[PDB]
Swiss-Prot record, chain A:
It is found in: Cytoplasm; Nucleus. Keywords: Cytoplasm, Isopeptide bond, Nucleus, Proteasome, Ubl conjugation. This is Proteasome subunit alpha type-3. InterPro entries: Ntn_hydrolases_N, Proteasome_alpha, Proteasome_alpha-type, Proteasome_asu_N, Proteasome_bsu_CS, Proteasome_sua/b. The gene is PRE9. One of its GO terms (biological process) is proteasome-mediated ubiquitin-dependent protein catabolic process. The proteasome degrades poly-ubiquitinated proteins in the cytoplasm and in the nucleus. It is essential for the regulated turnover of proteins and for the removal of misfolded proteins. The proteasome is a multicatalytic proteinase complex that is characterized by its ability to cleave peptides with Arg, Phe, Tyr, Leu, and Glu adjacent to the leaving group at neutral or slightly basic pH. It has an ATP-dependent proteolytic activity. Belongs to the peptidase T1A family. Present with 17100 molecules/cell in log phase SD medium. GO terms for cellular component: cytosol; nucleus; proteasome complex; proteasome core complex, alpha-subunit complex; proteasome storage granule. Pfam families: Proteasome, Proteasome_A_N.
Swiss-Prot record, chain B:
Non-catalytic component of the proteasome which degrades poly-ubiquitinated proteins in the cytoplasm and in the nucleus. It is essential for the regulated turnover of proteins and for the removal of misfolded proteins. The proteasome is a multicatalytic proteinase complex that is characterized by its ability to cleave peptides with Arg, Phe, Tyr, Leu, and Glu adjacent to the leaving group at neutral or slightly basic pH. It has an ATP-dependent proteolytic activity. PRE3 and PRE4 are necessary for the peptidyl-glutamyl-peptide-hydrolyzing activity. Present with 16900 molecules/cell in log phase SD medium. The lineage of its organism: Eukaryota, Fungi, Dikarya, Ascomycota, Saccharomycotina. Belongs to the peptidase T1B family. This is Proteasome subunit beta type-7. It comes from Saccharomyces cerevisiae (strain ATCC 204508 / S288c) (Baker's yeast).
Swiss-Prot record, chain C:
This is Proteasome subunit alpha type-6. Present with 7210 molecules/cell in log phase SD medium. One of its GO terms (biological process) is proteasomal ubiquitin-independent protein catabolic process. It is found in: Cytoplasm; Nucleus. There is a cross-link at residue 188 (Glycyl lysine isopeptide (Lys-Gly) (interchain with G-Cter in ubiquitin)). It comes from the Eukaryota. It comes from Saccharomyces cerevisiae (strain ATCC 204508 / S288c) (Baker's yeast). Belongs to the peptidase T1A family.
From Swiss-Prot, chain G:
Keywords: Cytoplasm, Isopeptide bond, Nucleus, Proteasome, Ubl conjugation. This is Proteasome subunit alpha type-2. It is found in: Cytoplasm; Nucleus. Gene3D superfamilies: Glutamine Phosphoribosylpyrophosphate, subunit 1, domain 1. It comes from Saccharomyces cerevisiae (strain ATCC 204508 / S288c). The 26S proteasome consists of a 20S proteasome core and two 19S regulatory subunits. The 20S proteasome core is composed of 28 subunits that are arranged in four stacked rings, resulting in a barrel-shaped structure. The two end rings are each formed by seven alpha subunits, and the two central rings are each formed by seven beta subunits. The catalytic chamber with the active sites is on the inside of the barrel. CDD domains: proteasome_alpha_type_2.
């Protein structure tokens, strides 16, 4: 019968590893680097677009940074199509929570549920896992500013600063070196860009090859604002830090 | 939940020494309208059984189709289909009785009253009744509808108990049935003059009589009846 | 070799290896014999034990008052097929007030075994059956094989060393067929038949198993001291 | 639905998928359980290759199943969340129907049953997780400590360890733990648990987690400074 | 609107002795004011020395008996030809009846036989499965006529020892099979006189350790 | 790979045969049947000294009149016991009586072959089912994952089964008392066990008509162990 | 019987590659060249009509398809896969948008729905990926004119101008030199025809070339009058004659 | 059919455990079907249940309850609580709510952790813990005798009489109650049956010995 053609996506190796999860992580390691840095008064999300062409429409484009709700955003590393499936599910889950409790969903609860979906694909169903790693940046009234990451295994962890995708080993060393706890958003913006600038596989880091976003309490009195940076705004912040 | 539309009235029957007789008129009533006049309500199954059906005619035609299909199915992979493993009256009855009770238990009955008349392989007479409720009973005489009220009393004067069956001939039994059909024509408003009659004998087999008529009727005394009490002219 | 992974695959010579491997399970099973006259039908079965401390595996199963079988091979598969026969016999009685013909019983078993040999996932039944019975056309003996093939016979035997008993019955055909109105003599012929398949072991009181059905005899099984008469 | 039998027998009578699930447990961070005279202590390793972590929000290794029972584990982290969720639901379901909280044995038997079901169900792989379940039965002061594993077998332990280098720490506990006289106090039990982890861990900084459970739903997690005091005390006594 | 129930009349009677038990019933079957049959048996030998009758709506009655007879057959298959005790049969019948709690069998069921000590046993059921063991039970159309007579003659109710100022009751004792049949016959001839649905014939099934015996008696046919 | 319900060329189901190898790796379990009762005994086999041996539950009650001992992948037995208990209680509900030991065993064995591509694999555990009923009296059954069950006068299963079965062949007779049977289980267990037999690493149980199924205390078994050693030294 | 293929046929290899997607892209590479160019006041999409036989009527086979009145599509790769995607794309525009909001979806969202369908064929049980790359041109009130590419993986990218299929590498280079942000629609059509001539080998005329535009509203193509707000479709397929007129002044 | 029959059942907590007392009459309209009905259901040796409302509904589901209680103690190696046993039954009938079950029962037991415990369980889903409960057509008559004479420090002998006398009061006045009285005493070690008492003989006996029922000539 059909047994002959089954790859058996949800099995253990002799060493106790999940083949498909490991190979999905290998796929993600070739994706454009994405960095998240958490400050005391906000969060930064920075991501490198995958080898840009000059005729690509840059201003009306979205590849790396997606909005989940007014208080939570994600940076993507891996297959974009896979990420969008998961993103729509996460958007729906956030609204279900708001409908039920009349309160915005706590960041971890959203992360846990999305990670539990990934876990399912590794344990049952016989389907390939989602080839995606997320960096979740968000705010709630319980824990304040929070950074998480999830990967195809469905395992998630919290971070002060973290990178996913390509050159994470080199990127994590640079972040570990220059990061400190009393850091501001404006300083974190500078760290994120400097790190990408050194770890990039490109010749020089430019505005057209980047996506950028912040989550500050920079709005008027005790409320959070999401800023997805425009092309011209990235051009300005790149000059202001002295990279170009 | 149903309501019957086109209906057939009484079916009457009795046992005699060597077999059974069954009869029913050829009418399909549509309420008070006597709409259809060429309706056969006696349906033979093989050469040893006759099923007489009253009530809803659309449901009767459905049962005809089931019995016809039953004969076909019994012949499959059956070298003795025309011998030892042929369909018996008791087999045909139990099948119908199962169906009738199952349909009443689904609140969607076959709106019929059925009498299965025949002779078994060992020569024993078979006569049993079943209706829309799945109710079953057997008796030396059986009748449905008005026949139960008017025919049974006449047929029970011939065969009042089991011991009267060997004493009753086919000539006497047929005479009583034909007389009963006349009485029903006198007194049942949804009956017709034309009818069918079937005899299943253990020796002479199945005899199926069509296009019979009620005859030797008494109507002459009607001319002497005037008014409703006092009237003289 | 490459064509025996499942029942859905034909070999280049047109063989179904899984069905043949199921047939092999019957050959390993203990011997059982079936034979009939015109009035009665008899099953004789050599029961097998695990060791001296264990009981002897029951080989004969009753299906109705007028029908039953003996098994050889996987016993659980016989339980499934015998249960199916019990239901079919019972359906015939409740719906049609009719005792199920032994021939139809065979046709129903054939069709049930067949479906398991044409579909992916499932497996063939790993047991052979000898069905006896008395119906409206007299006494009957059937041989069921899990390939689906059912055969009506005067006498037969299945299991290990069944060729010896089968040869004997082929010689004795003219004699035992005319044993009418005599149960004990028909059994004796069956006990002598199964004896031709014995090696080193002999028929003891808790080893032998006999069953009979006939004209004025319901399907009944004899075990223990009740078979001491025939040793 | 996906039906494939993934967990099956091999010629030598082994179910490799279940045994490979144990290898995943062997890869996981070390977890230890020690029960005293009036308490149970759950110790857990945290690998130190991960700096720049946020310990406020990062999932804790020890999880509360109810107010009186806790669950720690070794193996795949994602798999453990599924067992913990099911256990928490069953804990509330038991309170709803029996009008009484679960016993530690019952909760363990349920979790072990879930693990077993995944070893002979079509289309699923076994959980790459072994758990240590500890607590106190309602209106009872006798300490309970149970262990489960991917196959589904479970059993009670005076003291036990699971995860990487667990055979080393089990060796330590086997000579240091006395059945006739278990740790009489909370301090003694915690110290023995920390000592056993110090045979394997590396440094006693932010690598060791300790959770103490006492009778009548009295559970508390120790902070860094509190744990560091045990580490400082043990090392000074060692130099002798 | 279609009414799935009907009333086929008739009445039944079960009495238990010391080493025997009887289950009687009239043979008349009716609908409204018509007689369907003068001899239609509704007391059946179900095997294992158990006799059974399910009186009321005959279609439901035949279905129940048919299902119980089948239950006995499968009990033998599944439990190595073990004899089904009267108490086990009773519990089984409860589950048959209660299985249709929300679309009931419109019948009053009575079974009779011998218990495991060899003593006479009668069990009676309501339409939805409540049951009870009793020495005496009448069921059906004329139950209200027969039962108070049984109370008086079998269980000696309201009868006191002569001269004892109504202080000493008449002592309970087992009746012979001959005396019980006398009470059954007199019960049915009295019911026949005063109930229109009762008559034609009387069929009694007697159960002893030896087996099941039958007796038939004529009743008035009007 | 290959199908789960596949036959070998010799005519056996691969998966059933492979599950039998798993049962050989399991701890020893012995059962002996007498006219005074049936005795069941098992090797606990703790993997480590820190493991509390009293939590090892390899002897189990099904009903008051039926007991059960297991050997092999013991986790697989839980659903078998659950089914057995339900079958026993359900029959009591339907028939107001105790259920026959054979009928109970047959119900358990019907689960055995309900696997394929139903559960994904056969059970990797064998069961010794002991009990009493009015018809056939004291009984002992051996239920395999093949769906087959044999009745036994005495039976051993597990790692030391072939050695213990040969010993039971010589020792068993039809006039054994209950006390004699208890000692005989302990004697044979001590012979095949790796570690030295005592009350903590071995467990006894029995089923009698009068008192029903009972698991023995560690205090009671300890005295029977002491009684056993004295009798062997006495000649 | 029944579909027993409930498992993924596309899986990750040790190197991290999704084989079936890569092989699907290889099939797209073999496919005939198609392109799209965005202007200030419109969008153009074009492709070569590779005829299987001269007896075949190439008019009956439409490589450029209307999805909504303001959205069009063209492809490179396997034609049958494209045809069923167009059917599904048209239906999803109604079921998941027009029947809810009473208006046609904007280009980006319809593209998103098509991408979803193609992603599912990459992960669902018992199916292979679609062997096509789409170019979807469209207009909507709030986003204006737009051009999107969709790949077998389900990934989609917005383009100022691009090409896919056989000679896409050379064609993209040609478009980089010619494209600017001040291009009028007629200039974009002219560049499209120049770019396409390089990849086409045989005959180059209105019968062998298929070309459509997303431009101004066409009241004459609406089919009715009376509702002022309804002004007609922005999608228009250029005729064989209209193409040949522009090939003279080339 | 007729499931709506009369009854008088009671159960009360006291110093020495629980007393359970019931009548024995079953009626189909005015017709007295039986005088020998068992209205106490012996769920197991430690638990009792009372029958009121549907006879079948009470019999069937309280026997079923005994099966669930046996499975509980096999799995947990511990006696089931009265709370847990009552809740299994109440949750079950709640699933059937609206279908037409008719039930009014007292689930009675005596355990270590709880002591003597009574739960009134009812077919519309009600589950009440309490000290005194009376259910049936004659419940009002029985309550009057109970309320006026009840004390926690009653002896076992006096408590048994009180339950017997309360049923008699109902049997006398309520037409659909009578026949005989069945008594039970529930202790921690199990229930004890205290016999069947014909109301006919019991009435005259109580009249003479007590001096009550002067309105009745005897
Ligand atoms: Mg009369």
């Amino acid at each position: 019968g059909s047994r002959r053609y089954d790859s058996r996506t949800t099995i253990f190796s002799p060493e106790g590893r999940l083949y498909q999860v490991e190979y999905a992580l290998e796929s993600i390691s070739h994706a454009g680097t994405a960095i998240g840095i958490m400050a005391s008064d906000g969060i930064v999300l920075a991501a490198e677009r995958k080898v840009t062409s000059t005729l690509l429409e840059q201003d009306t484009s979205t590849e790396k940074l997606y909005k989940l709700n007014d208080k939570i955003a994600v940076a993507v590393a891996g297959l974009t199509a896979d990420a969008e499936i998961l993103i729509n599910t996460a958007r729906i889950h956030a609204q279900n929570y708001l409908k039920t409790y009349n309160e915005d969903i706590p960041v971890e609860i959203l992360v846990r549920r999305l990670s539990d979906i990934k876990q399912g694909y590794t344990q049952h169903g016989g389907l390939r896992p989602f080839g995606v790693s997320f960096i979740y940046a968000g705010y709630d009234d319980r824990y304040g500013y929070q950074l998480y990451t999830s990967n195809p295994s469905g395992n998630y962890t919290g971070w002060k600063a973290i990178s996913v995708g390509a050159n994470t080993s080199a990127a994590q060393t640079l972040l570990q070196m220059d990061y400190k706890d009393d850091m501001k958003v404006d300083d974190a913006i500078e760290l994120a860009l400097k790190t990408l600038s050194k770890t990039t596989d490109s010749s020089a880091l430019t505005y057209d090859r980047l996506e950028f976003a912040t989550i500050r309490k920079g709005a008027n009195d005790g409320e959070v604002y999401q800023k997805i940076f425009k092309p011209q705004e990235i051009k300005d912040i790149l000059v202001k830090t002295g990279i170009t | 939940t149903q309501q019957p539309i086109v209906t057939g009235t009484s079916v009457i029957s009795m046992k005699y020494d060597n077999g059974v007789i069954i009869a029913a008129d050829n009418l399909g009533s549509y309420g008070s309208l006597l709409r259809f006049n060429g309706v056969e309500r006696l349906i033979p199954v093989g050469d040893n059984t006759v099923v007489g059906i009253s009530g809803d005619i659309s449901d009767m035609q459905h049962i005809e189709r089931l019995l016809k299909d039953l004969v076909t199915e019994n012949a499959y992979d059956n070298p003795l289909a025309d011998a030892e493993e042929a369909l018996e009256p008791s087999y045909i009855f139990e099948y119908l009785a199962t169906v009738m009770y199952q349909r009443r238990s689904k609140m969607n009955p076959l709106w019929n009253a059925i009498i299965v008349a025949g002779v078994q392989s060992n020569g024993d007479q078979f006569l049993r009744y079943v209706n829309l409720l799945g109710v079953t009973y057997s008796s030396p005489t059986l009748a449905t509808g008005f026949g139960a009220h008017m025919a049974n009393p006449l047929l029970r004067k011939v065969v009042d108990r089991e011991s009267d069956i060997p004493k009753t001939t086919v000539q006497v039994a047929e005479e009583a049935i034909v007389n009963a059909m006349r009485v029903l024509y006198y007194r049942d408003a949804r009956s017709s003059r034309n009818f069918s009659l079937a005899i299943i004998d253990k020796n002479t087999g199945l005899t199926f009589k069509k296009n019979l008529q009620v005859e030797n009727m008494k109507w002459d005394f009607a001319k002497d009846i005037k008014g409703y009490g006092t009237q003289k002219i | 070799n490459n064509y025996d992974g499942d029942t859905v695959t034909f070999s280049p010579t047109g063989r179904l290896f899984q069905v043949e491997y199921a047939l092999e399970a019957i050959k390993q099973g203990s011997v059982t014999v079936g034979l009939r006259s015109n009035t009665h039908a008899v099953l004789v079965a050599l029961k097998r034990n695990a060791d001296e401390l264990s009981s002897y595996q029951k080989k004969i199963i009753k299906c109705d008052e007028h029908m039953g079988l003996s098994l050889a091979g996987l016993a659980p598969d016989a339980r499934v097929l015998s249960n199916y026969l019990r239901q079919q016999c019972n359906y015939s009685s409740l719906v049609f007030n009719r005792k199920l013909a032994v021939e139809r019983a065979g046709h129903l078993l054939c069709d049930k075994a067949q479906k398991n040999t044409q579909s992916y996932g499932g497996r063939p039944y790993g047991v052979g059956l000898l069905i006896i019975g008395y119906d409206k056309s007299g006494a009957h003996l059937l041989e069921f094989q899990p390939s689906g093939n059912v055969t009506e016979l005067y006498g037969t035997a299945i299991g290990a060393r069944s060729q010896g008993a089968k040869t004997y019955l082929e010689r004795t055909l003219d004699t035992f067929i005319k044993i009418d109105g005599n149960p004990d003599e028909l059994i004796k012929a069956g006990v002598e038949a199964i004896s031709q398949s014995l090696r080193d072991e002999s028929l003891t009181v808790d080893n032998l198993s006999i069953a009979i059905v006939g004209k004025d005899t319901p399907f009944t099984i004899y075990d223990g001291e009740a078979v001491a008469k025939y040793i | 639905g996906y039906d494939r039998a993934l967990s099956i027998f091999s010629p030598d009578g082994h179910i490799f998928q279940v045994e490979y699930a144990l290898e995943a447990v062997k890869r996981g961070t070390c977890a230890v359980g020690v029960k005293g005279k009036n308490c149970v202590v759950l110790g857990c390793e945290r690998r130190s290759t991960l700096k720049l972590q946020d310990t406020r929000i990062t999932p804790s290794k020890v999880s509360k199943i109810d107010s009186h029972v806790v669950l720690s584990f070794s193996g795949l982290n994602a798999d453990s969340r599924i067992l913990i969720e099911k256990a928490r639901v069953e804990a509330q379901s038991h309170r709803l129907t029996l009008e009484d909280p679960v016993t530690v044995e019952y909760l363990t038997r349920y979790v072990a049953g879930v693990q077993q079901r995944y070893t002979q169900s079509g289309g699923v792989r076994p959980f790459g997780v072994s758990t240590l379940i500890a607590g106190f039965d309602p209106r009872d002061d006798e300490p309970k400590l149970y262990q489960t594993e991917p196959s589904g077998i479970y059993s009670s332990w005076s003291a036990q360890t699971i995860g990487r280098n667990s055979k080393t720490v089990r060796e330590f506990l086997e000579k240091n733990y006395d059945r006739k006289e278990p740790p009489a106090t909370v301090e003694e039990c915690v110290k023995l648990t920390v000592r056993s982890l110090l045979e394997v861990v590396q440094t006693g900084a932010k690598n060791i987690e300790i959770t103490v459970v006492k009778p009548d739903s009295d559970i508390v997690a120790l902070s860094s400074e509190e744990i560091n005091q045990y580490v400082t005390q043990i090392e000074q006594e060692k130099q002798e | 609107q279609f009414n799935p129930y009907g009333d086929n009349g008739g009445t039944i009677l079960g009495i238990a002795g010391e080493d025997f038990a009887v289950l009687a019933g009239d043979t008349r079957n009716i609908t409204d004011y018509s007689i369907n049959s003068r001899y239609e048996p509704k007391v059946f030998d179900c095997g294992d020395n158990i006799v059974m009758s399910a009186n009321g709506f005959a279609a439901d009655g035949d279905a129940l008996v048919k299902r119980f007879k089948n239950s006995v057959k499968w009990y033998h298959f599944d439990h190595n030809d073990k004899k089904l005790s009267i108490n086990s049969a009773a519990r089984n019948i409860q589950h048959l009846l209660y299985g249709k709690r929300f679309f009931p069998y419109y019948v009053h069921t009575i079974i009779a036989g011998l218990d495991e000590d060899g003593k006479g046993a009668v069990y009676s059921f309501d339409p939805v499965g409540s049951y009870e063991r009793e020495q005496c039970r009448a069921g059906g159309a004329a139950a209200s006529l027969i039962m108070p007579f049984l109370d008086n003659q079998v269980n000696f109710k309201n009868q006191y020892e002569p001269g004892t100022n109504g202080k000493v009751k008449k002592p309970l004792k087992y009746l012979s099979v001959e005396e019980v049949i006398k009470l059954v016959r007199d019960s049915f001839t009295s019911a026949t006189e005063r109930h229109i649905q009762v008559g034609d014939g009387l069929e009694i099934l007697i159960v002893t350790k030896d087996g099941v015996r039958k007796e038939f008696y004529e009743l008035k046919r009007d | 790979d290959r199908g789960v319900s596949t036959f070998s060329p010799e005519g056996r189901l691969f998966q059933v045969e492979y599950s039998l190898e798993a049962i050989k790796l399991g701890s020893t379990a012995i059962g002996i049947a007498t006219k005074e009762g049936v005795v069941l005994g098992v090797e606990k086999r703790a993997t480590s000294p820190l493991l509390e041996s009293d939590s090892i539950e390899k002897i189990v009650e099904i009903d008051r009149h039926i007991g059960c001992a297991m050997s092999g992948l013991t986790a697989d037995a839980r659903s078998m016991i659950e089914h057995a208990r339900t079958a026993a209680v359900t029959h009591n509900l339907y028939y107001d009586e105790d259920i026959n030991v054979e009928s109970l065993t047959q119900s358990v064995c019907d689960l055995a072959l309900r696997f394929g591509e139903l559960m994904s694999r056969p059970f990797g555990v064998a069961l010794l089912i002991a009990g009493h009923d009015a018809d056939d009296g004291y009984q002992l059954f051996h239920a395999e994952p093949s769906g087959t069950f044999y009745r036994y006068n005495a039976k051993a299963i597990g790692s030391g089964s072939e050695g213990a079965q040969a010993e039971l062949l010589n020792e068993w007779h039809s006039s054994l008392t209950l006390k004699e049977a208890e000692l005989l289980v302990l004697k044979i267990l001590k012979q095949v066990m790796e570690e030295k037999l005592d009350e903590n690493n071995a467990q006894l149980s029995c089923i009698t008509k009068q008192d029903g199924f009972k698991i023995y205390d560690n205090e009671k078994t300890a005295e029977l162990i002491k009684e056993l050693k004295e009798k062997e030294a006495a000649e | 019987m029944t579909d027993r293929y409930s498992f993924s046929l596309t899986t990750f290899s040790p190197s991290g590659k999704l084989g079936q997607i890569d092989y699907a892209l290889t099939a797209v590479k073999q496919g005939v060249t198609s392109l799209g160019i965005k202007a200030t006041n419109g969008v153009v999409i074009a492709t070569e009509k590779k005829s299987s036989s001269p007896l075949a009527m190439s008019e009956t086979l439409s490589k450029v398809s209307l999805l909504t009145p303001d959205i069009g599509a063209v492809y490179s790769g396997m034609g049958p896969d494209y045809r069923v995607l167009v059917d599904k794309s048209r239906k999803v525009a109604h079921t998941s948008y027009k029947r809810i909001y009473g208006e046609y979806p904007p280009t980006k969202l319809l593209v998103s729905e098509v991408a979803k369908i193609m992603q599912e064929a990459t992960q669902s049980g018992g199916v292979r990926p679609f062997g096509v790359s789409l170019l979807i041109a469209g207009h909507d009130e709030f986003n204006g004119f737009s051009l999107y590419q969709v790949d077998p993986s389900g990934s989609y990218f917005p383009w100022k101008a691009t090409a896919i299929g056989k000679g896409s590498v050379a064609a993209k280079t040609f478009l980089e030199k010619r494209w600017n942000d001040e291009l009028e629609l007629e200039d974009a059509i002219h560049i499209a025809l120049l770019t396409l001539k390089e990849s086409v080998e045989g005959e180059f005329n209105g019968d062998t070339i298929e070309l459509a535009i997303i431009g101004d509203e066409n009241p004459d193509l609406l089919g009715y009058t009376g509702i002022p707000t309804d002004k007609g479709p922005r999608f228009r397929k250029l005729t064989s004659q209209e193409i040949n007129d522009r090939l003279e002044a080339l | 059919i007729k499931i709506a029959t009369g009854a008088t059942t009671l159960a009360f907590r006291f110093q020495g455990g629980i007393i359970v007392a019931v009548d024995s009459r079953a009626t189909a309209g005015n017709w007295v079907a039986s005088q020998t009905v068992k209205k106490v259901i012996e769920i197991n040796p430690f638990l009792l249940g009372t029958m009121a409302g549907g006879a079948a509904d009470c019999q069937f589901w309280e026997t079923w309850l005994g099966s669930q209680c046996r499975l509980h103690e096999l799995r947990e190696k511990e006696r089931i609580s009265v709370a847990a046993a009552s809740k299994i039954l109440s949750n079950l009938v709640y699933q059937y709510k609206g279908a037409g079950l008719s039930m009014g029962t007292m689930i009675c037991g005596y355990t270590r952790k709880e002591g003597p415990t009574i739960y009134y369980v009812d077919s519309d889903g009600t589950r009440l813990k309490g000290d005194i409960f009376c259910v049936g057509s004659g419940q009002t008559f029985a309550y009057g005798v109970l309320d006026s004479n009840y004390k926690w420090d009653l002896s076992v002998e006096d408590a048994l009489y009180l339950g017997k006398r309360s049923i008699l009061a109902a049997a006398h006045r309520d037409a659909y109650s009578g026949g005989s009285v069945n008594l039970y005493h529930v202790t921690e070690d199990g229930w004890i049956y205290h016999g069947n008492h014909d109301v006919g003989e019991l009435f005259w006996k109580v009249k003479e010995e007590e001096g009550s029922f002067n309105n009745v000539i005897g």
